[PDB]
Coordinates of C-alpha atoms and ligand atoms in Angstrom, one line a residue:
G1 CA -5.8 -7.1 2.9
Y2 CA -5.8 -8.8 -0.4
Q3 CA -2.7 -8.5 -2.5
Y4 CA -2.5 -6.9 -6.0
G5 CA -4.7 -8.9 -8.3
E6 CA -6.1 -11.6 -5.9
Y7 CA -9.4 -9.9 -5.8
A8 CA -9.3 -9.6 -9.6
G9 CA -8.8 -13.3 -9.8
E10 CA -11.7 -14.0 -7.4
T11 CA -14.1 -11.8 -9.4
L12 CA -12.8 -13.3 -12.6
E13 CA -13.6 -16.8 -11.3
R14 CA -17.1 -15.7 -10.2
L15 CA -17.8 -14.0 -13.5
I16 CA -16.7 -17.0 -15.6
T17 CA -18.2 -19.8 -13.5
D18 CA -21.4 -18.4 -11.9
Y19 CA -22.4 -16.3 -15.0
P20 CA -21.1 -17.8 -18.2
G21 CA -22.5 -17.0 -21.6
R22 CA -23.5 -13.4 -20.8
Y23 CA -25.2 -11.7 -23.8
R24 CA -28.1 -9.4 -24.6
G25 CA -31.6 -10.7 -23.5
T26 CA -30.3 -13.3 -21.1
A27 CA -31.0 -14.0 -17.4
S28 CA -27.3 -14.8 -17.2
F29 CA -26.6 -11.3 -18.4
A30 CA -28.8 -9.9 -15.6
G31 CA -27.0 -12.0 -13.0
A32 CA -23.6 -11.0 -14.4
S33 CA -24.6 -7.3 -14.3
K34 CA -25.7 -7.7 -10.7
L35 CA -22.4 -9.4 -9.9
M36 CA -20.5 -6.5 -11.6
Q37 CA -22.4 -3.9 -9.6
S38 CA -21.8 -5.9 -6.4
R39 CA -18.1 -6.3 -6.9
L40 CA -17.2 -2.6 -7.3
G41 CA -20.0 -1.2 -5.0
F42 CA -17.5 -0.4 -2.2
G43 CA -17.3 3.4 -1.9
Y44 CA -19.3 4.0 -5.1
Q45 CA -22.8 5.0 -6.0
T46 CA -23.2 2.2 -8.5
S47 CA -26.3 2.7 -10.7
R48 CA -27.0 0.5 -13.7
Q49 CA -28.3 2.4 -16.7
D50 CA -30.5 0.6 -19.3
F51 CA -30.3 1.8 -22.9
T52 CA -32.0 0.9 -26.1
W53 CA -31.1 1.0 -29.8
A54 CA -33.1 0.4 -33.0
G55 CA -36.3 -0.1 -31.0
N56 CA -36.6 -3.6 -29.5
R57 CA -32.8 -4.1 -29.0
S58 CA -31.9 -3.0 -25.5
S59 CA -29.4 -3.7 -22.7
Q60 CA -27.7 -2.0 -19.7
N61 CA -24.3 -0.9 -18.6
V62 CA -23.0 -0.7 -15.0
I63 CA -21.9 2.8 -13.9
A64 CA -19.9 3.4 -10.7
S65 CA -19.2 7.0 -9.9
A66 CA -16.9 8.6 -7.3
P67 CA -17.5 12.3 -6.6
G68 CA -14.6 14.6 -7.6
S69 CA -13.8 18.0 -6.3
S70 CA -12.6 19.3 -9.6
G71 CA -15.8 18.3 -11.3
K72 CA -14.0 16.3 -14.1
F73 CA -14.2 12.6 -13.9
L74 CA -12.1 9.8 -15.6
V75 CA -13.9 6.9 -17.2
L76 CA -12.6 3.3 -17.0
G77 CA -14.8 1.5 -19.6
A78 CA -14.7 -2.3 -20.0
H79 CA -17.5 -4.4 -21.3
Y80 CA -18.6 -7.7 -19.8
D81 CA -20.3 -9.1 -22.9
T82 CA -19.4 -12.1 -25.1
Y83 CA -20.2 -13.0 -28.7
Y84 CA -23.9 -13.1 -29.5
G85 CA -23.7 -16.6 -31.2
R86 CA -22.2 -18.1 -28.0
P87 CA -25.0 -18.9 -25.5
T88 CA -24.4 -20.3 -22.1
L89 CA -20.6 -20.6 -22.6
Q90 CA -18.0 -18.8 -20.5
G91 CA -16.1 -16.0 -22.3
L92 CA -12.8 -15.5 -20.5
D93 CA -10.4 -14.1 -23.1
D94 CA -12.9 -11.7 -24.6
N95 CA -13.5 -9.5 -21.6
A96 CA -13.7 -11.5 -18.4
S97 CA -10.1 -10.5 -17.6
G98 CA -11.0 -6.9 -18.5
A99 CA -14.0 -6.9 -16.2
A100 CA -12.0 -8.5 -13.4
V101 CA -9.2 -5.9 -13.7
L102 CA -11.8 -3.1 -13.9
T103 CA -13.5 -4.3 -10.6
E104 CA -10.0 -4.6 -9.1
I105 CA -9.2 -1.0 -10.0
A106 CA -12.5 0.3 -8.8
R107 CA -12.1 -1.4 -5.4
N108 CA -8.4 -0.3 -5.1
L109 CA -9.6 3.2 -5.6
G110 CA -12.5 2.9 -3.1
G111 CA -12.4 5.1 0.0
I112 CA -9.7 7.3 -1.5
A113 CA -10.2 11.0 -1.8
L114 CA -9.8 12.0 -5.5
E115 CA -9.4 15.6 -6.8
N116 CA -10.6 14.2 -10.1
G117 CA -13.5 11.8 -9.7
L118 CA -13.4 8.2 -11.0
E119 CA -16.3 6.9 -13.1
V120 CA -15.7 3.1 -13.5
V121 CA -18.0 1.9 -16.3
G122 CA -18.7 -1.7 -17.1
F123 CA -20.1 -1.7 -20.6
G124 CA -22.3 -4.4 -22.2
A125 CA -23.6 -5.6 -25.5
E126 CA -20.3 -4.3 -27.0
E127 CA -20.0 -7.3 -29.2
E128 CA -23.3 -6.3 -30.7
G129 CA -21.7 -3.3 -32.5
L130 CA -20.3 -1.1 -29.7
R131 CA -23.8 -0.4 -28.6
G132 CA -23.0 0.1 -24.9
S133 CA -20.2 2.7 -25.5
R134 CA -22.2 4.7 -28.1
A135 CA -25.3 4.7 -25.9
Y136 CA -23.2 5.9 -22.9
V137 CA -21.7 8.7 -25.0
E138 CA -25.2 9.6 -26.2
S139 CA -26.4 9.8 -22.6
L140 CA -23.5 12.3 -22.0
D141 CA -24.6 15.9 -22.3
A142 CA -22.5 19.0 -23.0
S143 CA -21.3 19.4 -19.4
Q144 CA -20.2 15.8 -19.1
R145 CA -18.4 15.9 -22.4
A146 CA -16.7 19.1 -21.4
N147 CA -15.7 17.5 -18.0
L148 CA -14.4 14.2 -19.6
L149 CA -10.8 14.4 -18.4
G150 CA -10.2 11.2 -20.4
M151 CA -11.1 7.6 -21.1
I152 CA -9.4 4.3 -20.3
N153 CA -10.6 1.1 -22.0
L154 CA -10.0 -2.6 -21.2
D155 CA -10.4 -5.6 -23.4
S156 CA -8.8 -9.0 -23.9
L157 CA -6.4 -8.8 -21.0
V158 CA -5.2 -12.5 -21.0
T159 CA -4.6 -14.0 -24.4
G160 CA -2.1 -11.6 -25.7
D161 CA 1.5 -12.5 -24.7
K162 CA 2.8 -8.9 -25.0
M163 CA 0.4 -6.4 -23.4
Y164 CA -0.1 -3.1 -25.2
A165 CA -1.5 0.3 -24.3
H166 CA -2.2 2.5 -27.3
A167 CA -4.0 5.8 -27.6
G168 CA -6.9 6.6 -29.9
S169 CA -7.0 7.1 -33.7
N170 CA -7.4 10.8 -33.0
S171 CA -3.8 11.0 -31.8
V172 CA -2.7 12.0 -35.3
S173 CA -4.2 15.4 -35.0
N174 CA -3.2 16.4 -31.5
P175 CA 0.3 15.0 -30.5
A176 CA -0.8 15.6 -26.8
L177 CA -3.9 13.3 -27.2
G178 CA -1.9 10.3 -26.1
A179 CA -1.2 11.7 -22.7
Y180 CA -2.6 8.6 -21.0
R181 CA -0.5 6.4 -23.3
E182 CA 2.6 8.3 -22.3
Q183 CA 1.7 8.2 -18.6
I184 CA 1.0 4.4 -18.6
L185 CA 4.3 3.8 -20.5
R186 CA 6.2 5.8 -17.9
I187 CA 4.6 3.9 -15.0
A188 CA 5.2 0.5 -16.7
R189 CA 8.8 1.5 -17.2
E190 CA 9.2 2.6 -13.6
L191 CA 7.5 -0.4 -12.1
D192 CA 9.4 -3.1 -14.1
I193 CA 6.1 -4.0 -15.9
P194 CA 6.7 -4.9 -19.6
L195 CA 4.2 -2.9 -21.6
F196 CA 4.8 -2.3 -25.3
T197 CA 2.7 -0.1 -27.6
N198 CA 1.4 -0.3 -31.2
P199 CA 4.4 -0.6 -33.5
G200 CA 2.5 1.0 -36.3
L201 CA 3.9 -1.4 -38.8
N202 CA 0.6 -1.7 -40.7
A203 CA -0.3 1.4 -42.6
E204 CA -4.0 0.5 -42.1
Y205 CA -3.9 1.6 -38.5
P206 CA -2.2 4.7 -37.1
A207 CA 1.1 4.3 -35.4
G208 CA 0.8 3.8 -31.7
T209 CA -3.0 3.7 -31.7
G210 CA -5.6 1.0 -31.5
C211 CA -9.1 0.6 -32.9
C212 CA -12.4 -1.4 -32.7
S213 CA -13.1 -1.1 -29.0
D214 CA -15.2 0.9 -26.6
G215 CA -13.3 4.2 -27.3
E216 CA -14.5 4.4 -30.8
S217 CA -17.4 6.5 -29.5
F218 CA -15.1 8.5 -27.2
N219 CA -12.9 9.4 -30.2
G220 CA -15.6 12.0 -31.1
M221 CA -14.1 14.5 -28.7
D222 CA -10.5 15.8 -28.4
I223 CA -10.0 14.1 -25.0
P224 CA -7.3 11.5 -24.1
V225 CA -8.2 7.9 -25.0
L226 CA -6.4 4.8 -24.0
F227 CA -7.1 1.3 -25.3
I228 CA -5.5 -1.4 -23.1
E229 CA -5.4 -4.8 -24.8
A230 CA -3.3 -7.9 -24.8
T231 CA -2.5 -8.9 -28.4
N232 CA 0.5 -9.7 -30.6
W233 CA 0.9 -7.0 -33.3
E234 CA 4.0 -8.6 -34.8
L235 CA 2.2 -11.8 -35.7
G236 CA -0.3 -12.6 -38.5
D237 CA -1.6 -9.8 -40.6
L238 CA -0.2 -7.3 -38.0
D239 CA -3.7 -6.5 -36.8
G240 CA -3.6 -8.4 -33.5
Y241 CA -6.1 -11.1 -34.4
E242 CA -3.4 -13.8 -33.7
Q243 CA -3.1 -12.4 -30.2
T244 CA -0.7 -15.1 -29.0
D245 CA 2.2 -16.9 -30.6
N246 CA 1.6 -19.9 -28.4
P247 CA -0.1 -22.8 -30.1
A248 CA -3.5 -22.3 -28.4
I249 CA -5.9 -22.1 -31.3
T250 CA -8.2 -17.6 -30.7
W251 CA -11.0 -15.1 -30.2
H252 CA -14.4 -15.5 -28.7
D253 CA -16.0 -18.7 -29.9
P254 CA -17.7 -21.8 -28.4
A255 CA -14.9 -24.2 -29.4
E256 CA -12.3 -22.3 -27.3
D257 CA -12.0 -19.6 -24.7
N258 CA -12.7 -21.7 -21.6
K259 CA -11.3 -21.5 -18.1
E260 CA -9.8 -25.1 -18.2
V261 CA -8.7 -24.8 -21.8
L262 CA -6.9 -21.5 -21.1
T263 CA -5.3 -22.9 -18.0
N264 CA -4.1 -25.9 -19.8
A265 CA -2.7 -24.1 -22.9
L266 CA -1.4 -20.8 -21.4
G267 CA -0.8 -21.8 -17.8
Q268 CA -2.8 -20.4 -14.8
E269 CA 0.4 -18.6 -13.6
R270 CA 0.5 -16.6 -16.8
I271 CA -3.1 -15.4 -16.5
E272 CA -2.8 -14.6 -12.8
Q273 CA 0.5 -12.7 -13.3
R274 CA -0.9 -10.7 -16.3
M275 CA -4.0 -9.9 -14.3
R276 CA -1.9 -8.7 -11.3
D277 CA 0.3 -6.6 -13.6
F278 CA -2.7 -5.0 -15.2
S279 CA -4.3 -4.3 -11.8
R280 CA -1.1 -2.7 -10.4
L281 CA -0.3 -0.7 -13.6
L282 CA -3.9 0.6 -14.0
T283 CA -4.2 1.4 -10.3
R284 CA -1.0 3.5 -10.5
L285 CA -2.1 5.1 -13.7
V286 CA -5.5 6.1 -12.2
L287 CA -3.8 7.4 -9.1
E288 CA -1.4 9.6 -11.1
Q289 CA -4.2 10.7 -13.5
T290 CA -7.2 11.4 -11.2
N291 CA -4.7 13.4 -9.0
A292 CA -5.6 11.2 -6.1
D293 CA -1.9 10.6 -5.6
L294 CA -1.4 14.4 -5.7
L295 CA -4.2 14.8 -3.1
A296 CA -2.6 12.2 -0.8
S297 CA 0.8 13.8 -1.3
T298 CA -0.5 17.2 -0.4
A299 CA -2.3 15.7 2.7
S300 CA 1.0 14.1 3.8
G301 CA 2.8 17.4 3.1
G302 CA 0.4 19.2 5.3
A303 CA 0.9 16.7 8.0
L304 CA 4.7 17.0 7.6
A305 CA 4.6 20.8 7.7
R306 CA 2.4 20.7 10.8
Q307 CA 4.7 18.2 12.5
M308 CA 7.7 20.4 11.5
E309 CA 6.1 23.4 13.2
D310 CA 5.3 21.3 16.2
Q311 CA 8.9 20.1 16.3
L312 CA 10.1 23.7 16.2
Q313 CA 7.8 24.7 19.0
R314 CA 8.9 21.6 21.0
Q315 CA 12.6 22.6 20.6
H316 CA 11.9 26.1 21.8
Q317 CA 9.8 24.9 24.7
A318 CA 12.7 22.7 25.6
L319 CA 15.0 25.7 25.5
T320 CA 12.5 27.5 27.8
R321 CA 12.5 24.5 30.1
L322 CA 16.3 24.6 30.2
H323 CA 16.0 28.3 31.2
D324 CA 13.4 27.3 33.8
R325 CA 15.7 24.7 35.3
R326 CA 18.5 27.3 35.4
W327 CA 16.1 29.7 37.1
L328 CA 15.2 27.0 39.6
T329 CA 18.9 26.6 40.3
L330 CA 19.4 30.4 40.6
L331 CA 16.5 31.1 42.9
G332 CA 18.5 29.5 45.8
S333 CA 22.0 30.4 47.1
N334 CA 22.2 33.7 45.4
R335 CA 26.0 33.8 46.1
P336 CA 28.2 36.9 45.7
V337 CA 28.2 38.7 42.4
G338 CA 31.0 38.3 39.8
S339 CA 33.4 35.4 40.3
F340 CA 33.1 32.3 38.1
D341 CA 29.5 31.1 37.5
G342 CA 29.3 29.7 34.0
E343 CA 27.4 26.5 33.3
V344 CA 27.5 24.0 30.5
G345 CA 26.2 20.5 29.9
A346 CA 24.4 18.0 27.6
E347 CA 20.7 17.4 27.8
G348 CA 18.6 14.6 26.4
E349 CA 14.9 13.9 26.0
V350 CA 12.8 10.9 25.1
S351 CA 9.2 11.5 23.8
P352 CA 6.9 8.6 24.1
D353 CA 4.9 7.6 21.0
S354 CA 1.7 8.2 23.0
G355 CA 1.6 11.9 21.8
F356 CA -0.3 10.9 18.6
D357 CA -2.4 13.9 17.6
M358 CA -0.5 14.5 14.3
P359 CA -1.2 11.8 11.7
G360 CA 2.3 10.6 11.6
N361 CA 2.5 9.1 15.1
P362 CA 5.2 11.4 16.4
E363 CA 7.8 9.4 18.3
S364 CA 10.6 11.7 19.0
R365 CA 13.9 12.1 21.0
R366 CA 15.9 15.2 21.7
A367 CA 19.6 15.7 22.6
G368 CA 22.2 18.4 22.4
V369 CA 24.6 20.8 24.2
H370 CA 23.9 24.1 25.9
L371 CA 25.9 26.9 27.7
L372 CA 25.0 29.3 30.5
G373 CA 26.4 32.3 32.3
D374 CA 25.0 35.1 34.4
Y375 CA 26.2 37.7 36.9
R376 CA 24.9 41.2 37.9
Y377 CA 25.3 43.4 41.0
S378 CA 22.9 43.8 44.0
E379 CA 22.2 40.1 43.8
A380 CA 18.6 41.0 42.9
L381 CA 18.6 41.2 39.1
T382 CA 21.0 39.0 37.1
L383 CA 21.0 38.9 33.3
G384 CA 22.9 36.2 31.4
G385 CA 23.0 34.3 28.1
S386 CA 22.9 30.8 26.8
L387 CA 24.1 29.0 23.6
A388 CA 22.1 25.8 22.9
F389 CA 22.3 23.0 20.4
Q390 CA 19.5 20.5 19.8
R391 CA 18.8 17.7 17.4
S392 CA 15.2 16.4 17.8
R393 CA 14.8 13.4 15.5
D394 CA 11.1 13.5 15.4
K395 CA 10.1 10.3 13.6
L396 CA 7.0 10.0 11.4
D397 CA 5.2 6.8 10.3
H398 CA 6.0 4.4 7.5
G399 CA 9.7 5.2 7.9
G400 CA 9.3 9.0 7.9
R401 CA 11.9 10.9 9.7
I402 CA 12.5 14.6 10.5
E403 CA 15.7 15.7 12.1
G404 CA 17.5 19.0 12.4
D405 CA 20.5 20.5 14.1
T406 CA 19.6 23.7 16.0
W407 CA 21.5 26.7 17.4
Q408 CA 19.8 28.7 20.1
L409 CA 20.8 32.0 21.6
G410 CA 18.9 33.5 24.5
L411 CA 19.2 36.5 26.8
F412 CA 17.3 36.2 30.1
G413 CA 17.2 38.3 33.3
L414 CA 16.0 36.9 36.6
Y415 CA 15.0 39.4 39.3
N416 CA 14.4 38.5 43.0
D417 CA 15.0 40.7 46.0
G418 CA 15.1 37.5 48.2
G419 CA 11.4 37.5 49.1
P420 CA 8.6 35.4 47.8
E421 CA 8.0 37.6 44.8
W422 CA 10.1 37.1 41.6
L423 CA 9.9 38.1 37.9
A424 CA 12.1 37.7 34.9
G425 CA 12.3 38.0 31.1
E426 CA 13.7 36.1 28.2
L427 CA 14.4 36.2 24.4
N428 CA 15.6 33.6 21.9
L429 CA 17.0 33.1 18.4
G430 CA 17.1 29.8 16.5
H431 CA 18.7 28.8 13.2
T432 CA 17.8 25.2 12.5
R433 CA 18.1 23.0 9.4
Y434 CA 15.5 20.3 8.9
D435 CA 16.3 17.3 6.7
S436 CA 12.8 16.3 5.8
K437 CA 12.2 12.6 4.8
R438 CA 8.5 12.1 4.6
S439 CA 6.4 9.1 3.4
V440 CA 3.3 9.1 1.3
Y441 CA 1.6 5.7 2.1
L442 CA -1.7 5.6 0.2
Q443 CA -3.7 2.4 0.2
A444 CA -7.3 1.3 -0.1
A445 CA -9.3 0.1 2.8
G446 CA -8.3 -3.6 2.8
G447 CA -6.5 -3.1 -0.5
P448 CA -2.8 -3.4 -1.3
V449 CA -0.3 -0.6 -1.2
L450 CA -1.4 1.8 -4.0
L451 CA 1.8 3.9 -3.8
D452 CA 4.7 4.2 -1.3
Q453 CA 7.1 7.0 -2.2
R454 CA 9.6 8.7 0.1
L455 CA 10.4 12.4 -0.5
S456 CA 13.5 14.2 0.8
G457 CA 14.1 17.9 1.3
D458 CA 16.2 20.4 3.2
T459 CA 15.0 23.6 4.8
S460 CA 16.3 26.2 7.2
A461 CA 13.9 28.0 9.6
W462 CA 14.6 30.9 11.8
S463 CA 12.7 31.7 15.0
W464 CA 12.7 34.6 17.4
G465 CA 10.5 35.9 20.2
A466 CA 10.3 36.9 23.8
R467 CA 9.1 35.5 27.2
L468 CA 8.7 36.5 30.8
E469 CA 7.4 34.8 34.0
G470 CA 7.1 35.4 37.7
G471 CA 5.1 35.0 40.8
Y472 CA 5.2 34.6 44.6
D473 CA 4.4 31.8 47.1
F474 CA 4.6 30.7 50.7
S475 CA 5.9 27.4 52.1
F476 CA 5.1 24.8 54.7
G477 CA 8.2 23.0 55.9
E478 CA 11.2 23.0 53.5
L479 CA 9.2 23.0 50.2
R480 CA 7.6 26.0 48.4
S481 CA 4.9 26.2 45.8
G482 CA 2.6 28.8 44.4
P483 CA 1.0 30.5 41.3
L484 CA 3.3 31.5 38.5
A485 CA 2.2 33.6 35.4
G486 CA 4.1 33.8 32.1
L487 CA 3.9 35.1 28.6
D488 CA 5.4 33.2 25.6
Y489 CA 6.0 34.6 22.2
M490 CA 7.8 33.1 19.1
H491 CA 7.4 34.3 15.6
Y492 CA 8.5 31.2 13.7
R493 CA 9.6 31.5 10.1
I494 CA 9.9 28.3 8.0
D495 CA 11.5 29.1 4.7
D496 CA 10.1 27.6 1.5
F497 CA 11.8 24.4 0.2
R498 CA 11.1 22.0 -2.7
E499 CA 11.6 18.3 -2.4
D500 CA 14.7 16.9 -4.1
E501 CA 13.0 13.8 -5.4
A502 CA 11.5 14.0 -8.9
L503 CA 8.2 12.3 -8.5
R504 CA 4.5 13.2 -8.8
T505 CA 4.2 13.1 -5.0
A506 CA 7.0 15.5 -4.4
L507 CA 5.7 18.9 -3.2
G508 CA 6.7 22.5 -3.3
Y509 CA 6.3 24.3 0.0
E510 CA 6.0 28.0 0.9
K511 CA 7.3 30.5 3.5
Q512 CA 5.5 30.3 6.8
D513 CA 5.3 33.6 8.7
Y514 CA 3.2 32.8 11.7
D515 CA 3.4 33.8 15.4
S516 CA 2.7 31.9 18.6
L517 CA 1.5 33.9 21.7
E518 CA 1.2 31.4 24.6
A519 CA -0.2 33.5 27.4
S520 CA -0.1 31.3 30.5
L521 CA -1.3 31.0 34.1
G522 CA -0.6 28.2 36.6
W523 CA 1.1 26.9 39.7
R524 CA 4.7 25.9 40.4
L525 CA 6.7 24.2 43.1
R526 CA 10.3 24.7 44.3
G527 CA 12.1 23.1 47.3
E528 CA 15.4 21.8 48.5
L529 CA 16.0 18.3 50.0
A530 CA 19.7 18.3 50.8
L531 CA 20.2 14.6 51.6
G532 CA 23.9 13.8 51.7
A533 CA 27.1 15.8 52.3
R534 CA 27.1 17.5 48.9
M535 CA 23.7 16.5 47.3
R536 CA 20.9 19.1 47.3
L537 CA 17.9 18.0 45.4
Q538 CA 15.5 20.6 44.0
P539 CA 12.0 19.3 43.6
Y540 CA 9.8 21.3 41.2
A541 CA 6.6 20.8 39.3
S542 CA 4.2 22.9 37.3
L543 CA 0.5 22.9 36.2
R544 CA 0.0 25.9 33.9
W545 CA -2.6 26.6 31.2
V546 CA -2.1 28.2 27.8
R547 CA -4.5 30.2 25.7
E548 CA -3.3 31.5 22.3
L549 CA -4.4 35.0 21.2
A550 CA -3.4 34.2 17.6
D551 CA -3.1 31.4 15.1
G552 CA -0.4 29.6 17.1
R553 CA 0.6 27.5 14.1
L554 CA -0.3 27.7 10.5
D555 CA -3.5 25.8 9.5
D556 CA -3.6 25.8 5.7
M557 CA -0.7 26.0 3.3
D558 CA -0.8 26.8 -0.4
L559 CA 1.1 23.8 -1.8
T560 CA 1.9 22.8 -5.4
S561 CA 2.8 19.3 -6.5
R562 CA 5.9 18.9 -8.6
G563 CA 4.0 16.6 -10.9
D564 CA 1.3 19.1 -12.0
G565 CA 2.0 22.4 -10.3
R566 CA -1.6 23.6 -9.5
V567 CA -2.4 25.5 -6.3
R568 CA -3.6 23.0 -3.7
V569 CA -5.0 24.0 -0.3
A570 CA -3.9 21.4 2.3
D571 CA -5.6 21.3 5.7
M572 CA -3.3 20.5 8.7
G573 CA -6.3 20.4 11.1
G574 CA -7.3 22.6 13.9
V575 CA -5.0 24.4 16.3
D576 CA -5.4 23.5 19.9
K577 CA -5.7 27.0 21.4
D578 CA -7.1 25.9 24.8
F579 CA -5.0 23.5 26.9
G580 CA -2.4 23.3 29.5
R581 CA 1.0 21.8 30.1
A582 CA 2.5 20.3 33.3
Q583 CA 6.0 19.6 34.5
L584 CA 7.6 17.3 37.1
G585 CA 11.0 16.3 38.3
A586 CA 13.9 17.5 40.4
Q587 CA 17.5 18.7 40.0
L588 CA 20.4 17.0 41.8
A589 CA 23.9 18.4 42.5
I590 CA 26.6 15.7 42.6
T591 CA 29.0 18.4 43.7
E592 CA 29.0 22.2 43.7
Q593 CA 29.5 21.9 39.9
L594 CA 28.0 18.7 38.5
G595 CA 24.2 18.1 38.6
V596 CA 21.7 15.9 36.8
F597 CA 18.0 16.1 36.4
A598 CA 14.9 14.3 35.0
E599 CA 12.1 16.5 33.9
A600 CA 8.8 15.2 32.4
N601 CA 6.7 17.7 30.4
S602 CA 3.2 16.6 29.4
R603 CA 0.8 18.8 27.5
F604 CA -2.8 17.8 28.3
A605 CA -6.0 18.8 26.6
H606 CA -9.3 17.0 27.2
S607 CA -10.6 17.3 23.6
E608 CA -7.5 16.9 21.3
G609 CA -3.8 17.1 22.0
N610 CA -2.1 15.0 24.7
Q611 CA 1.6 15.2 23.8
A612 CA 3.9 13.7 26.4
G613 CA 7.7 14.1 26.9
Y614 CA 10.5 13.0 29.1
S615 CA 14.0 14.5 29.5
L616 CA 17.2 13.8 31.4
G617 CA 20.4 15.8 31.4
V618 CA 23.5 16.8 33.3
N619 CA 25.0 20.2 34.0
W620 CA 28.7 20.8 34.6
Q621 CA 28.6 24.3 36.3
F622 CA 32.1 25.4 35.3
Ligands
LIG701 N1 -7.7 -5.6 -34.0 C1 -8.3 -5.5 -32.8 N2 -8.4 -4.3 -32.2 N3 -8.9 -6.6 -32.3 C2 -9.6 -6.6 -31.0 C3 -11.1 -6.6 -31.2 C4 -11.8 -6.9 -29.9 C5 -13.3 -6.9 -30.0 N4 -13.8 -5.5 -30.2 C6 -13.9 -7.5 -28.8 O1 -14.4 -6.9 -27.8 O2 -14.0 -8.8 -28.7
ZN702 ZN1 -15.5 -10.0 -28.9
ZN703 ZN1 -13.9 -7.4 -26.0

């Protein structure tokens, strides 16, 4: 997509060349307004609103609106009108740059969900005595004025060497009025964007505040106001009229303010760079202010929490698969009770990136240690334990990464009287420690990177539960296979953790107390192909369905952003409660003690959820 400000440059060129000399009662003005609406119409319900003042005098202003859940919109006003006594002559410095940056911001916010709506307003006939802004405020009713979260104004975004962003003249009463001024100062400081403010040297104007722009009408209410202009308050009468210390001339007039003249005197690189800086700065300000960044961060946090729960369930399903391999081994050559029968080994797993489902493209890989041991008399029932370690570095998108060491303790008892029928049981306990590193990559459709922040966090989550399986089967030849039924239960608990990073996008999680009840039914296989003097392969595969009787995994979490702290409901999507998983592989025995394996587990659902996974490990039975 287009970089930061390139689209602003394109729309500036179109505005200044195709429709120069835009003023009230002009066909060029109508063409310019049509162009203005056409530029920012992406993702907006643009609707020009004609107004009148003093009878015959009338004009119109472009309004682009984005629906907001909170019902309080933020207004980005910037007129596209030139001086009245300047017909058919391009006005660049006056507000062409402002209009270009405004359309740039409107497009960069297009297609983005916003908790607070954005109402990009392109004013007109402003040079005629602020008619557009006053008429817009007049059209506002009590509800709109109550819901005016704030106002941002643009004007003369090129000529001024040092850019400024000063709040309204009403900042003297409420010290908190200049909230937008403070936010834009913070963003400019954090993005290496030089942005001063009003020095307040002149007593005629309030310190840190501007005047004589669109927000003169918005000052009527105690709402944040932000004038964004490029001037030079340390030069001339300290009122910004001499906006540039360069030779140049300086304001809107026929004799100056032309594309070629500005390019020759101030350099095209300067105008382009200032337009890019304004685009990026205001895009970040609108993101942080309309809480669109908070909405994106909460959406990414919901995705991260869902993926963390999926990682925990994947780890415990890997533990149960290890138990299943041990049971496969145990179902043959029962051997005398007692003696030495402990087992140990390392197991690894590679998860293909084809799982998808979760928004982060979950490419994962598992590895770790595990222990085993089991003996009991009568050779029918044998109960034993296991001590497992696992570190599944489930990797998100845009550099996101989740990883956690895990300790697992299980007690399982396998019962078989030597016949076709068998049954068993199982329990588990897991004390993992996630090191969350998620990414919040928010960008417009075809637009540049609006914001790319990486959060970090540390959480410990416990998990317990129970399990049991069994069945019976016949066999043709040396290989057996038949129906197996099982019950899986795990009451995961993910403790609340707050992100270490101090940003707006950092989140504050909550305790997750949810249970998964995977009732199952399927078919299994088990055989022995003893090719070689010591090798005895154990083919085995499964095709079993699962139907949850409960939530399975938490759907919606109450999250609060560190920037604001309000209660935000984040949706992690639906929970696939109707699917089935399949297994495949075999187990080798290099000797009586050593033995490798290669199991592939592949959850399959026809509607949504097709996770896949491979695994290879070696057991030293000693
Ligand atoms: N001292 C100032 N605030 N000067 C800037 C005035 C800009 C003027 N309202 C315009 O739109 O062209
Ligand atoms: Zn002007
Ligand atoms: Zn202006």
